[PDB]
């Protein structure tokens, strides 16, 4: 009613206790470098990437950092009950970054429902969509056991998709033709840039985290960074084309930079060689901008399926892409590992998505967690006390 | 008095350049210099200027027309810092041998007169953050040096009741000052650096450790109190607040409030339980004092003292775990507060001095007094 | 060696480049005519 | 025409892409690579956002500059090193192409909102084989020791983009322009930029430094060298200003002069006390260029610095280079003092040549320069939103 959130908080909060003391118990200084990249990446890239609209900067940076932070208590739960199958277990660096990258699977969600949940409504679906992403992950690497190093099918297509359901669920016909809040602004997308260079200077560490040090970790690192430096120029080049008047739009330069990035995950480890990762990453950003210019207009309008910050343009798409480029290069002989291993992975982690996002936004569609009105989607003044200056 | 701002034209230049100067002077003198490791020995002390520089820069940049003054003058704080904590730690724990392990502690030295600094900007010159930046450096190392002769510990490892030496130091100073608001991209650009003290702060709990298993256990202990803590701190701000609204300010405030809770006995922690729960508890302790603190200057900077000073008691506790040794440090608490106190009462008084040209109580948080804008009426 | 290789990247991008741009500007001035 | 930018961004990526096919093959460094990423593309990129109205054309043009720089100057100094044969892609590559990209936005800081991106990237694939081969020479040919590019990287760029400027000179902007004028939150957000850059500016110095003294040395020296040089830009910029004021570009650039002046004598045992003396001199001679020299370059020689990127890179990178030529003298390094010398003189020379000829490629009306009145707007490229 009024003490629901902070009620929903500490209970989850004390749960989270219970449950580290029943089952948590605690190579390290070596990937702790790219930890720390990672958890800059999770807090400060996605805090900041969605802080584009105009009067919504408080309440997407602020629950980013909330759902970040209750997810990396969730999902380091939630993944080492499954790795360790219902045992107790140690914490060690490895645990800490699947744990952000559990987060990092929740806020792509976000980005798809965001301005028009309530922290309440985010809390549920970091419960509900860690619980769906771990079980989709633990199939995808023990049961089929495909290379899905760097994610493109687990964390990006998987959270793109669960957005587009929990969207889907949430739909509001009053915010189809368009809202007066949803719009940018000048020092809201300088805000947007800095969080979209801290995702794209980081993610190499975020694909080469899990990786196998040595070649592998290696091979990882350059292919993430050739890919984004290939992925920057198509993505200028085909913003400029699709627009009026040439004129570059700041929601490509924002996004679909980081699609090169999304795409050579399946990849990253595998001997696609520097020219097939610089051929993927101008794919994904030819693919990302087509995406965000001519695709969400056709899933906003006609699908029913409002994209706020146009995760599937940039996750989905770039993802399935990496799911695609993954199986081909498994043909090509540049790693081991089955194509059909791989394709499994990737129709599983949609699959799994969409359901798992069906029911995620069922839960919160139900009129008790003080969700916004259309008048007032995209509106810090909901939850925060807004400054009267800006 | 005249409220249009005294020149300091040749204040602050011969006095900044004179600092410099005695600085070098003093490195010639007195400091000398002198491998498989140094990358990862270099990246905890990077960690320290990196939360030092930018998140206490910005923390504090929430101001509606103080955020340059706030962002430029924790710079400058920072730069002077340094350089005086490293020749003070070698005046008073002994040539001075320059390594990275030296300018890691002379970071945290520095950090204790950012953190302290917090409840003065807005109301100070740049002069009178020369004189505090000094005699907080100098009091620090002076505590330090008594406690290490005193209870026989090391002098590098009294350095862990910094932010509460801070803290009091800061409430002190803020208090004997004359006595006399925000902005939405200021308070993002203020929550961009709480996110960057956030994220790297379990590496500061870390530095004073050596052992790679105290160390490690204190990295897990602080990041895992540090989430508990932003959730609790984020879930209760809806309580502790008139509207019943989420305040920035009180985000940005109490985000670190785990982890000045296991600041002191993080290595001491032997299961997450525990830190959580202490996350946890700093976390309602945090709303508590939002709430209440404004009924009896700077209300984030009470709260800061009441986190550190239950995270004293706690490592008072979990210190036994792990009759004599609880008088030993509650005397060691004690010493530091009444130090503390006494050094900021000592520098209140010092910057009450004319010779500041301090800035008029009528022109309390506004950068047009220390900085160039265009089309201004400029002199008399 | 590595000179002339570097010169020769240049110049087949400068041909490519300027013959795309000549061929655009001789179509432009027949249309518009 | 319109489709000028996209179809040369296309037809550049596939010219990468082909000479990564052709050349290229396939981690105690990559932190320090990460930290000179970080400077590369946030320090620079936010550093030159301080025009009200061309945040998004400095951060975009930046990004876009700086991603097709690596891959370029990857294949130009892979060439260079290999003598034009296939090379190994390691950490260290990477870490000289960051070092590339910053010579180009270096460059680009000079000629910021009087150029297209077209213009830009054809500055950049220009800039990158002169500065290569520059680079080359000096690291091989006269085997100086800049570790960390004080000529090579900083004076190059500067006087690069000083000698673009000034071909590309523009007579209705030399009494200024309205668009040409910081605002707050501006300012605001050019001080990310400038932090980012002091914190991570030692591992700049130190990435490709030898492992053991060396590094350390060079972390040190640039530590204390930035440190002093704060405290001595700060002066400085109180004493030039009306009232002792604080001028915000000061602060946004000077400040980090001493990274810049430290760069040649890094590695070498100049001791903690000469670091701070040469980031000293160097902040001091930072403030005064902007406060005389920036005015006297706009009016007299007829060259305009939007960022006023001679007075951070290409004077304390002749500061430095004379520092290193004077330590080498001093007996702190076992190079050649003559090597040093040259290096300074050449990469000066070097730089303005390069500079002479890419201006004189880009003074072709094809590549969509802004008009005199559109000059500093983001809308001349950009899709800019109705509010702020």
Not at chain 1, 358 to 365: A, E, F, Q, V
Not at chain 2, 136 to 163: P, W
Request: aromatic content about 12%; overall charge positive; hydrophobic content about 55%.
């Amino acid at each position: 009613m009024r003490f629901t959130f902070p009620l929903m908080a500490i209970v989850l909060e004390i749960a989270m206790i219970v449950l580290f003391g029943l089952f948590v118990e605690y190579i390290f200084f070596e990937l702790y470098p790219l930890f720390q990249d990672v958890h800059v990446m999770i807090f400060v890239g996605f805090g900041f990437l969605m802080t584009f609209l105009k009067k919504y900067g408080f309440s997407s940076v602020g629950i980013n950092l909330l759902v970040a932070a209750l997810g990396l208590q969730w999902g380091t739960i939630v993944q080492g009950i499954l790795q360790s199958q219902g045992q107790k277990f140690n914490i060690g660096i490895k645990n800490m970054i699947n744990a952000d990258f559990s987060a990092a699977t929740v806020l792509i969600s976000f980005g798809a429902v965001l301005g028009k949940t309530s922290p309440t409504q985010m809390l549920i679906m970091t419960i509900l969509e860690i619980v769906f992403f771990a079980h989709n992950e633990y199939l995808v690497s023990e049961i089929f056991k495909a290379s899905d190093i760097g994610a493109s099918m687990t964390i990006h297509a998987f959270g793109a998709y669960f957005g587009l359901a929990v969207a889907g669920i949430l739909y509001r016909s009053g915010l189809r033709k368009g809202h007066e809040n949803e719009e940018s602004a000048y020092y809201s997308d300088l805000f947007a840039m800095i969080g979209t260079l801290f995702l794209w200077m980081f993610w190499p560490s975020f694909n080469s985290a899990i990786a196998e040090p040595g070649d592998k970790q290696c091979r990882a690192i350059v292919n993430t960074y050739f890919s984004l430096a290939a992925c920057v120029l198509t993505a200028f080049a085909f913003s400029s084309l699709v627009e009026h008047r040439g004129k570059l739009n700041m929601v490509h330069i924002q996004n679909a930079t980081l699609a090169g990035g999304v795409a050579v995950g399946t990849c990253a480890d595998m001997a696609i060689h520097p020219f097939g990762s610089m051929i993927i990453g101008s794919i994904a950003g030819m693919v990302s901008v087509l995406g965000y210019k001519f695709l969400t207009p056709l899933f906003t309008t006609k699908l029913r399926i409002h994209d706020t910050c146009g995760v599937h343009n940039l996750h989905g798409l770039p993802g399935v892409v990496g799911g695609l480029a993954g199986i081909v290069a498994v043909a090509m002989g540049a790693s081991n590992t089955s194509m059909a291993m791989q394709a499994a992975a990737l129709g599983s982690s949609i699959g799994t998505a969409v359901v798992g996002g069906l029911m995620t936004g069922l839960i919160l569609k139900l009129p008790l967690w003080g969700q916004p009105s259309d008048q007032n989607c995209y509106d810090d003044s909901v939850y925060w006390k807004v400054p009267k200056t800006r | 008095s005249s409220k249009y701002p005294r020149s300091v034209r040749r204040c602050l230049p011969l006095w900044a350049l004179t600092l410099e100067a005695a600085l070098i002077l003093l490195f010639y003198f007195f400091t000398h210099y002198d491998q498989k490791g140094l990358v990862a020995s270099y990246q905890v002390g990077q960690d320290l200027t990196v939360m030092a520089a930018l998140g206490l820069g910005f923390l504090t940049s929430n101001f509606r027309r103080h955020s340059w003054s706030s962002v430029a003058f924790n710079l400058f704080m920072l730069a002077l810092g340094v350089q005086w904590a490293i020749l003070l730690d070698g005046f008073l724990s002994q040539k001075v041998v320059i390594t990275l392990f030296s300018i890691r502690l002379a970071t945290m030295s520095a950090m204790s007169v950012l953190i302290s600094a917090g409840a003065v900007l807005g109301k100070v010159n740049l002069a009178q953050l020369v004189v505090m930046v000094l005699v907080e450096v100098t009091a620090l190392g002076t505590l330090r040096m008594v406690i290490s002769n005193i209870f026989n510990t090391d002098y590098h490892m009294n350095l862990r009741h910094f932010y509460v030496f801070a803290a009091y130091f800061g409430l002190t100073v803020a208090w004997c000052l004359p006595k006399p608001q925000r902005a939405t991209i200021p308070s993002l650009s203020a929550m961009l650096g709480a996110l960057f003290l956030w994220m790297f702060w379990p590496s500061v709990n870390s530095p004073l450790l050596r052992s790679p298993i105290q160390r490690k256990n204190a990295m897990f202990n602080t990041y895992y109190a540090l989430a508990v803590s932003v959730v609790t701190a984020i879930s209760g701000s809806s309580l502790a607040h008139p509207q019943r609204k989420i305040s920035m300010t009180y985000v940005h405030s109490a985000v670190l409030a785990g982890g000045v809770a296991v600041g002191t006995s993080c290595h001491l922690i032997p299961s997450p339980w525990l830190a959580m729960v202490l996350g946890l508890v700093a976390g309602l302790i945090s709303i508590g004092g939002a709430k209440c603190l404004p009924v009896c200057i700077s209300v984030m900077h009470s709260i800061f003292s009441l986190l550190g000073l239950l995270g004293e008691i706690t490592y008072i506790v979990l210190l036994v775990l792990h009759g004599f040794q609880v008088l030993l440090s509650i005397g060691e608490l004690s010493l530091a507060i009444v130090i503390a106190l006494t050094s900021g009462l000592l520098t209140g008084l010092l910057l009450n001095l004319k010779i500041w040209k301090a800035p008029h109580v009528a022109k309390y948080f506004d950068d047009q007094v220390f900085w160039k804008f265009p089309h201004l009426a400029v002199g008399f | 060696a590595p000179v002339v290789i570097i010169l020769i990247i240049l110049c087949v991008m400068a041909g490519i480049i300027g013959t795309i741009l000549l061929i655009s500007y001789s179509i432009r001035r027949l249309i518009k005519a």
